[PDB]
Amino acid sequence: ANPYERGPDPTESSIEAVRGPFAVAQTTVSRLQADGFGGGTIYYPTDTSQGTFGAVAISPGFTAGQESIAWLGPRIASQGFVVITIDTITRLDQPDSRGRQLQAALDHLRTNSVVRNRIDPNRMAVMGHAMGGGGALSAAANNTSLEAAIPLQGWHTRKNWSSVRTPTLVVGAQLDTIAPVSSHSEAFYNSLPSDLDKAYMELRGASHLVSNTPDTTTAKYSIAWLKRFVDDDLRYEQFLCPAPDDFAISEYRSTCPFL
């Protein structure tokens, strides 16, 4: 049996839920306490009886704070993850810096006194919105040990992601005028290795800021991706393979069935 499985068997409704089966608590990392990032909030399950949990770091985008991504923290953590939503050192940091700060936030979790005993430090993942999604790709491109990467409406000047060895879900917004999918999201998917475990999901009718308020499509497939690749939880592959039926999804492609 897979020792990383957490929670009961999933359904479409269970991954769509605003809160999963794990009650969550939170702790704050101040800007002064944070080495190499701007502080953040750590959301974690309070129930330890099923074992430790994988860890996820999430970055906002250009001219955006932690509040623009905060909703993802408890929504993902309540499914069985330790999740840190960060502020960046400055609001004008570019994607490569945001990726370095995602790595710094993950490094911070390893010695954080509140969550040290709740994390599996060998099972880690990065996500981000807009420039923060570019940062998530950069972080994975600099660390082949990361288990999942999820850029949401990602923005980056770098279009070639052939160095990435981390399973990646690219979430685009169909009507994005800031990080249009043709030159950002889909370009990133296409340059990821053709044999990587990867998927492209486009949100029908969505604008650039879809990730900054609760979006159930984003949440459900982000949760399924983290389960499948941070926990190796095969119970969640059913939601990723084949192309979802969601009317909310205007385009999709993947390297299903996953390795």
Ligand SMILES: O=C(O)c1ccc(C(=O)O)cc1
């Ligand atoms: O004006 C830009 O080029 C630009 C604006 C916002 C973002 C973001 O939302 O991260 C990225 C790029």
